[PDB]
Design a protein around this ligand. Sequence first.
Ligand code: GTP
Ligand code: GTP
Lengths: 71, 51, 521, 71, 109, 148, 225, 51, 52
Amino acid sequence: RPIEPQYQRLYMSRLRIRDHSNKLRQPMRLRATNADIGSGSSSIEWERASNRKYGAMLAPPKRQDFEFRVV
Amino acid sequence: YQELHPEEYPIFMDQELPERRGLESLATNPSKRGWLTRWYEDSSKYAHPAA
Amino acid sequence: SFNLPRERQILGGLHADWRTQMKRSGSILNDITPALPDTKRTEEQRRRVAGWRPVVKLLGDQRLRIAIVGRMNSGKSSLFNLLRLEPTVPGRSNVVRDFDGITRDSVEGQAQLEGMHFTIIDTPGMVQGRMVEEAFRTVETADAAIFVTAVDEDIMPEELSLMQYLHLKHMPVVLLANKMDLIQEEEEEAVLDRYNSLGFGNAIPFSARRKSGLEMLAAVLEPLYHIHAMHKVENDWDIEDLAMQGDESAMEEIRERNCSDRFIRIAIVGRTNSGKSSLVNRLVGFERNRAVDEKNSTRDPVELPCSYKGRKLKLIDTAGLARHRYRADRDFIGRIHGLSVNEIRFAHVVIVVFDATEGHPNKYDMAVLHSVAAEGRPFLLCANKWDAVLDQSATAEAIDFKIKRQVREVKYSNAVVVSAHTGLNLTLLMDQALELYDKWNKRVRRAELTRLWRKMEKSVVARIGRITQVNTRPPTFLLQLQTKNDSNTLPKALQEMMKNTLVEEFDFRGVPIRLIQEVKD
Amino acid sequence: LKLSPDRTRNEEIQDRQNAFVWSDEHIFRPHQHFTHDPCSWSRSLEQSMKKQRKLSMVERLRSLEQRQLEE
Amino acid sequence: FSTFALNPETSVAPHGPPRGLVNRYVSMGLPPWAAWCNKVNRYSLYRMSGVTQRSFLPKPPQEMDVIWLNERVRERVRTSRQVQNVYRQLKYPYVKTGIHYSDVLDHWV
Amino acid sequence: TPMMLNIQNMMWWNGKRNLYRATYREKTWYEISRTGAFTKGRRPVMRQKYSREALQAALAMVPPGFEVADVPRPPQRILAQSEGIVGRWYSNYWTLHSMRYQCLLAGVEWPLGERQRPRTNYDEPFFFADFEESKARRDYRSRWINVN
Amino acid sequence: PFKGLPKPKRQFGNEAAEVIWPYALLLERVVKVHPFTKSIYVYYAQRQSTARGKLAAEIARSFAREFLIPITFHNSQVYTEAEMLLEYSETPWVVLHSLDNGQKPRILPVAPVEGTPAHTAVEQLLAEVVQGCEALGASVADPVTATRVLNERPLQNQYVRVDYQWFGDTPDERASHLVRWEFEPEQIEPKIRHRTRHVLDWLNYDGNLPTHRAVHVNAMREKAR
Amino acid sequence: PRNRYEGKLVFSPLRLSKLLWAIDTGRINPNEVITLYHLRQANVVGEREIV
Amino acid sequence: TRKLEFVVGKKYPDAVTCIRRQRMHRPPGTLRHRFLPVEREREKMDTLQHLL
RNA sequence: AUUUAAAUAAUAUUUUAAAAUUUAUUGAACUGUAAUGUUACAGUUGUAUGUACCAAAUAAAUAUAGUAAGAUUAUUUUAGUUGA
Ligand SMILES: Nc1nc2c(ncn2[C@@H]2O[C@H](COP(=O)(O)OP(=O)(O)OP(=O)(O)O)[C@@H](O)[C@H]2O)c(=O)[nH]1
Ligand SMILES: Nc1nc2c(ncn2[C@@H]2O[C@H](COP(=O)(O)OP(=O)(O)OP(=O)(O)O)[C@@H](O)[C@H]2O)c(=O)[nH]1
């Protein structure tokens, strides 16, 4: 059942407060989505960073090497 | 990443197979036309290591 | 040639298994201590135990005695607590856990299945493949035995040896399988076939969680109950016929007066290593319980009926009381502390043991004494290890100083020195306990109370005109206030002074007293 | 509220709810074995729960029986 | 049967730390359960990695009269009963007066 | 102890400094923390790109009776650097495999061998001793069986 | 020393199962056979009339005692057994089964060459047995069903009375010198009242938690002293 | 609810109508086997939605 | 109470109310009260026995 | 996953003032002791006081400034409710 509109407004305000001058900017989502996760990597400075692009953290871990030691 | 940036890989780097979740859901799913359906259905690979 | 030295990967000497790390951590996490093996009894110790004498007579329960035996985690404690039913001491539940050897000492309690009243005994599980001497004694005393086994663990050479021992001793034993809810029909067939081929006979299925087999178990025991009743009545007829001797006449007198009277619950309390188990062993005349140097030697209360000087009673030993600081870290010992407190709350007399080697009772000892006083049980204080303490006079002076410094009725508590190994003043301790119970049940005259109050008023708010003793077991006095203002009660200092006066005059020395402020209406 | 119980509240609830046995709570005539199964879903779930665990005793007995049969 | 027990057929969603995080901790060289920490940032990861030794000696190397081969004073940290606060305490090695006998000197030293 | 007490002793803040620290730190804690610049995650390690003749000369100077399996991968707490052909480069794990990749790119035949030998069928020897307990787990047959 | 393990078969040829096996010997003898192999049964005779028969029986006994328990230990899905028959004979044999119940078991005799050392004879017999197992596994029909049966089959090496000397009793102790990525999140996840508290106590790292006021007071007192 | 745990398969939508519109306009060649790389190069999708 | 009055007022606006404020929320006149203090929770059983 | 949008931008958030507390340091020329004007002892503190505000002095700091308070720079204006 939907939460009370007052509390929903309070939470949406807490999401809005990030950028207040820009009225065109839609409020932040409760849970991050693909576009929000990928925008940072899409930016140019991150566009060059190949290790953080296309959901690198979201994807499951890479297979470790045949021989692996930590000492 | 390799598919989106083939320029950076002059040679076909060994492609790791997906995880167990991927194998169960998509890669080896006849309904989804998983690209590993044929490999999963094969039997010689279970028959002998050589195959 | 080109190789690196072998070396551990995880740094700091840690372990990849949080369970291994937990067991390394220890007490704060694993509160339950491991199984206690049989103690090393020397030849001299055996000789001294043989030389001991029983200061009280242990009574053989006339009802059928049935003992449950088997390996650890076999469901024996669960079956025991399902069968048992205590109408007089609620909260007597044996500790049950998934660990091994949780039951430290043998326990006994009255149980009934289908209107058949008998006494059932739980014994510690096999440890090192050799049951403890207390378990052997209890099994031998018991009239019948139920050997309980689980299905998630195949039979073991320890169980085979126990079965052979029971066969050698000719103990009538019935085989039960207590975890049949974890097994399926096809596997049930095989396990039941193995149990049948064992040699005893058709193993009765049972499941403690499902409470299945209780109705079936009763049918198996009913022949034993009937034959035991026949033997009991035969013994009674023989006693009646041979009463002319005099010893049998005295036995008949005992067996009549025990029914004509009611048992008095004497509960022994103390810290983990006070020596209450040794004290009860000395009192009963042998090592019914087990005493070890380990702090928390026993984890469950034990009750032993017995008669002292022709007065029935049930001597009770408790696990031990620990401070909240320790209990919070180790809740489990907190559980056994709660179990002990439950029995203290229902005892008719309480005896607090404190090791004399310490030199004087501890603050926690005084706390326990005040707790029993508040509960309203005649409290007695006993200094143990008196044969080991060095400065007897200094220890006695310290004990007396502590008692005097105590503020409430505990100030009147009587301290007695008792030694287990040597066995000193045990008869005096029992006599004092009986005297305390008599004072507890003592009665006072209304005229005497009124005259005493009048004299006190002349000797030293709203006055009172009528004082009477309403209750009997805990002596409670009702004092009526000559005012209709419901909040104009008496000062706590005044009521404490009145209680002290009553204790001093009517000899309620080791007995707590209660007062009720009543207003007219 | 229980200080050191072997069974948590959920475990106690499970133990009390599993005490129910339709076999004792009702009767079942032979003709019904071929046309009716009151304990279908619950009994299937119970059998699956039993399968979840693996009993060393029964496994060893079955393995020994199979070894004897092989010869 | 009981509805308070998860059905064997049902599969609850994964909740604990993922294989990626556990692999990061293992690569750092810690047990998998070491992934259970109240809070962790880049600096905390560097601190708990162990590549840097946070120990010391009572006196500088040119003044330490006692023979400390590799033992150093180390502070151990213990959380309170509530995880809100932590207390630290320094620990020193077991200094035993070695009364040895040297063949060359022929006399106990 | 100031560090235990969490006292901010910094020369530019209060003119003080803890006495248990080191006066010179070659690389700050952030530099130590950044591992991608220290390990072989994605970064190339040998910047030299030799020609076919140079690769052949390197393989010639490599001594006989040497296999790639004889050079274990260095642990993670060791800098992943690939020196040139300065000396016995075949000892350096990263330089060896970087030269292997360069030879693969250039079409130069690689005689040293593979890092791991896949044993497809059951052939001699039939019994082997592995006191390190790694060969049995790493066996291709075992991996194949587990996957199946 | 070890309790709860199943009791090994008490045949006259199954002395290896009863004898305690040091872990060093098992590590030295590591034999891998096709897991579709189900059971290996070596059968030899107590006494042999002919000298060649006696040699064959001797090499069969040596092969059993040496490479029978190791096969079971290192496969965990193969039941290996040896039996001595109170009967004259000169042709000891080996019976190989497979997870396919429809597959006829294979019989491999012992055929010693004119003259060779015991070590060479045992090695040749082991090679022949391994080749036979591989051929049987390859010829098994319905390999998918065979693999399912392999998954469903229990471990047959539970009766081996191994003796770990210095490697460690637990698998973690034995593999302490290796990194194990094959962990289960559910198993590793600590399950205790304060798992974070206990983890931080175990490994001395503060979860960015403030120091204790008691510690501050003690430190100030020490500074004063 | 709807927790994006690591390894969860949360695919970004790709409207079949959008793909057909791209083909009709001419940014995607029907004669070739379409792939995510081809879509990216044709610019029918942006880097924001390539997770 | 607040809950009852608000529910009835906001749902049944034309709801009549029958109350005597003088004797509402008070005990009857033929009722006597006795608040007995107890030094500790243990004395409560003895007080109850005395009352009975 | 039957099934309609969009200008990917982030950095900020009055001002003055809490009995503050924290870190480090100095002061026995005043005062209070012991010693015979001088010496020795000092802020989890020396003997009412420790240099004309003893919760001392000096140096550093912008603590839940919030549920203290005060101040807050741009007249000629152009639309809804005045105790719910
Ligand atoms: N499935 C199932 N489990 C049971 C049953 N009865 C007991 N258990 C389990 O067995 C464990 C052992 O508990 P107890 O039988 O009470 O312990 P005990 O009988 O005193 O054995 P010891 O502690 O070694 O002396 C308990 O934690 C229960 O979880 C049963 O009927 N069915
Ligand atoms: N020398 C001596 N020691 C005694 C005496 N009475 C008790 N003890 C001590 O009590 C120890 C045995 O422990 P227990 O008798 O079981 O008493 P406990 O430690 O409290 O055990 P539980 O009450 O069952 O928890 C012995 O090691 C003795 O040191 C005594 O009269 N003389």
